[PDB]
Amino acid sequence: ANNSLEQKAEQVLAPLRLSKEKLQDLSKTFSDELLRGLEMHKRHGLKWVPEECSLRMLDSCVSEIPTGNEKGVFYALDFGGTNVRAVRCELLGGGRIRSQQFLKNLYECGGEIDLMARETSASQLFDVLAGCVGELVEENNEKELLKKKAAKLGFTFSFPCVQRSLNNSVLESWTKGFATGHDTDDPVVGKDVVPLLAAAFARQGLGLECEAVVNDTVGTLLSCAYQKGPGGPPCTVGVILGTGANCCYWEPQAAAFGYRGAVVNVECGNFNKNLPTTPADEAIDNKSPNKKHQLFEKMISGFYLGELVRLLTLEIFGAAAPAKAREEFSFDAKQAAVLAASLMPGKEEDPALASSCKVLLKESWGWDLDAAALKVMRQIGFAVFDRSAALAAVSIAVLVQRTRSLETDGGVTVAVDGSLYVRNEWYGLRIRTFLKELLGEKVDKVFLRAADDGSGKGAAICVAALH
Numbered sequence: 001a002n003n004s005l006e007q008k009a010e011q012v013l014a015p016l017r018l019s020k021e022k023l024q025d026l027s028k029t030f031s032d033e034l035l036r037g038l039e040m041h042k043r044h045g046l047k048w049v050p051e052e053c054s055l056r057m058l059d060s061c062v063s064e065i066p067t068g069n070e071k072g073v074f075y076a077l078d079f080g081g082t083n084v085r086a087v088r089c090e091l092l093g094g095g096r097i098r099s100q101q102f103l104k105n106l107y108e109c110g111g112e113i114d115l116m117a118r119e120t121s122a123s124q125l126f127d128v129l130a131g132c133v134g135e136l137v138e139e140n141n142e143k144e145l146l147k148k149k150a151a152k153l154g155f156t157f158s159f160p161c162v163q164r165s166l167n168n169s170v171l172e173s174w175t176k177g178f179a180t181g182h183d184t185d186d187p188v189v190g191k192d193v194v195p196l197l198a199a200a201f202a203r204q205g206l207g208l209e210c211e212a213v214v215n216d217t218v219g220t221l222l223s224c225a226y227q228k229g230p231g232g233p234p235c236t237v238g239v240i241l242g243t244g245a246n247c248c249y250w251e252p253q254a255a256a257f258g259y260r261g262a263v264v265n266v267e268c269g270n271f272n273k274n275l276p277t278t279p280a281d282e283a284i285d286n287k288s289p290n291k292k293h294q295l296f297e298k299m300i301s302g303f304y305l306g307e308l309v310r311l312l313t314l315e316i317f318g319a320a321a322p323a324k325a326r327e328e329f330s331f332d333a334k335q336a337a338v339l340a341a342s343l344m345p346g347k348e349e350d351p352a353l354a355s356s357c358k359v360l361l362k363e364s365w366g367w368d369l370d371a372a373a374l375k376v377m378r379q380i381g382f383a384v385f386d387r388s389a390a391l392a393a394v395s396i397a398v399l400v401q402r403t404r405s406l407e408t409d410g411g412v413t414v415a416v417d418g419s420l421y422v423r424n425e426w427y428g429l430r431i432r433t434f435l436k437e438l439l440g441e442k443v444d445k446v447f448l449r450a451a452d453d454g455s456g457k458g459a460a461i462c463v464a465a466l467h
């Protein structure tokens with residue numbers, strides 16, 4: 001019988017099932033790396049030195065954490081790619097916020113102008129960004145009010161930058177397909193984006209003052225801090241587990257290490273020390289456009305989990321694998337989650353979840369596979385997702401410990417957002433299981449809390465907390 005299939009699956013998947021000792025060792029490695037990063041920051045400031053630390057340990061310049069009692073109307077601009085969003089937030093106190101948003105697809109906004117093109121000027125791009133916010137101001141009939149007294153605005157600008165202060169961030173290089181300004185006298189690269197945005201607001205008569213540029217993880221922490229309610233411990237860790245994976249945290253010795261803010265954007269997706277690398281991980285990195293970078297994220301985030309399932313399927317099934325498994329990106333993290341859900345605690349014998357796996361594999365890969373093969377595929381999906389949760393837990397545990405919040409405040413609130421956590425109830429519970437492995441009984445003082453819209457609401461909250 002081809003029960004060597006089960007032996008092969010065990011051989012291939014065992015290295016993805018991280019032992020307690022392996023997770024503790026990785027926690028130690030990550031904590032040591034974080035300390036090296038603080039020392040790097042103290043020496044080098046705005047200059048990243050990858051030989052000293054794989055973690056950029058960026059100064060967010062955020063020091064003012066909201067209480068939930070702040071009140072007023074605050075705006076945000078979320079520019080992380082072609083899907084731009086303006087947000088308006090009524091901060092009502094008691095942790096309550098009412099939001100509105102306006103969306104623009106940059107592919108449809110130049111008319112006769114490709115906004116992503118090297119021939120497009122900074123002014124043309126920022127005119128469109130400012131116009132997104134202006135459309136929201138006009139929806140609220142607020143343009144004249146804002147001429148009398150400007151509203152404050154936070155800006156999530158999700159590109160590599162050099163940030164000297166909360167309201168001063170210079171674009172280091174374009175990513176994500178953008179090349180705006182490269183062939184003009186009016187570049188974005190090498191310029192502080194805040195004066196460019198301010199000039200565009202002025203050209204439209206818009207009374208908005210950008211007081212912060214904020215990373216999405218920091219916005220996630222701030223969204224949670226405002227909305228959680230005082231009846232619990234402080235929010236000192238922010239986590240995104242979605243298409244990408246990153247965290248931020250409140251650093252108690254920030255001043256001694258040369259930080260202006262207290263919140264550090266770790267950029268831990270690039271963590272690269274003593275990773276539990278498997279051949280599938282090497283294959284994902286080797287064909288990626290960012291070889292040797294984001295190696296921790298490549299084991300964790302939704303962009304990669306489907307690819308992991310696909311490559312492991314090919315490794316385990318060989319000539320029995322379906323033809324579509326040979327196609328890059330043919331299987332995504334939502335599909336992998338269907339597989340993993342069927343092997344979560346208490347669900348291993350659930351017929352409906354297993355049936356959903358059979359239906360999925362027929363639809364996505366045209367694979368009319370037998371019972372033994374179906375069980376193996378479920379095990380592959382489970383192994384990939386459970387490793388993502390375990391590694392996320394390592395990062396959370398190390399940051400929780402570094403905040404000292406358990407010692408100083410008796411507990412900690414960890415803000416979490418991102419599709420892996422939001423779409424899969426069991427994912428956070430797996431994270432908590434691994435956190436208990438890492439932290440012991442004091443995990444009962446750690447509270448994972450869903451936090452929404454760090455890139456919009458969170459940036460508006462950032463500027464509201466400055467008052």
Ligand SMILES: OC[C@H]1O[C@H](O)[C@H](O)[C@@H](O)[C@H]1O
Pocket residue numbers: 215216217240243244245246247267269297
């Ligand atoms: O969006 C989540 C996450 O994605 C990547 O890791 C980016 O490098 C980070 O800035 C981060 O915040």
